[PDB]
Design a protein around this ligand. Structure first.
Ligand SMILES: C=CCCn1cc(C)nc1C(=O)O
Ligand SMILES: [Zn+2]
Ligand SMILES: [Zn+2]
Length: 231
């Protein structure tokens, strides 16, 4: 079964095999007085691994690398952060010290700098406009437009029809928007629609936090977001 928040002490990381050569990583972290789970992705990239997002902090990200070495045994050589918040770049300095080349879009790198968060080394070109997509090893990177944040990316693994939605996608059980300080509530439903249009055959959809599901997570997130706009 998919690991849940109460099963992972802060500082430990679980790996979950989704398909051949595709894993999610699950960690936990405190935020505003509570502990939350958080998802990232690992994809086999030939003899190497591509990492999508840190495990939300330096300690968790170190545990992530150790679990990968123990369970998979291939080197993590590149990482992509899908926006500038700490559950996505927190741990970049550990990745860099371990030998991982870290990447994000120019906007994400800039917003991380403005926020005082860790900054991926390398800029991803070709993602500056809504609807832009680029290839990056075994995945496609997609910028759907502003949603959870103005810079948020999603990631598709064609070999397995896996869609990693990041924090722009909510889990089914999450019924309130919660913290949306950096969100663009007006654009978020439109951005979700671009994800739907671009990946209509996604069979496994991973939210930024919580249990994976299917394409139903997209309408579910629009429902939550629009309900927040009404009142
Ligand atoms: C779900 C957790 C509560 C709010 N939150 C904190 C962080 C790092 N990320 C989020 C988010 O909503 O994406
Ligand atoms: Zn975020
Ligand atoms: Zn988040």
């Amino acid at each position: 079964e998919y690991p849940t928040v109460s099963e992972i002490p802060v500082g430990e990381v679980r790996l979950y095999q989704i398909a051949d050569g595709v894993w999610s990583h699950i960690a936990t972290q405190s935020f505003d007085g509570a502990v939350y789970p958080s998802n990232g992705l690992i994809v086999r990239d030939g003899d190497e691994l591509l990492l999508i997002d840190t495990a939300w902090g330096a300690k968790n990200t170190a545990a992530l690398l150790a679990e990968i070495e123990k369970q998979i045994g291939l080197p993590v050589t590149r990482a992509v952060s899908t926006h500038f918040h700490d559950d996505r770049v927190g741990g970049v300095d550990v990745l860099r010290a371990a030998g991982v080349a870290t990447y994000a879009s120019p906007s994400t790198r800039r917003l991380a700098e403005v926020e005082g968060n860790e900054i991926p080394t390398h800029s991803l070109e070709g993602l500056s406009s809504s609807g832009d997509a680029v290839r990056f090893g075994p995945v496609e990177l997609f910028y759907p437009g502003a949603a959870h944040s103005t810079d948020n990316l999603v990631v598709y693994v064609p070999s397995a029809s896996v869609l990693y939605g990041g924090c722009a996608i909510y889990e089914l059980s999450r019924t309130s928007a919660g913290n949306v300080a950096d969100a663009d509530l007006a654009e978020w439903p439109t951005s979700i629609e671009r994800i739907q249009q671009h990946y209509p055959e996604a069979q496994f959809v991973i939210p930024g936090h919580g249990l994976p599901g299917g394409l139903d997570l997209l309408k579910h997130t629009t429902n939550v977001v629009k309900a927040h706009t009404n009142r």
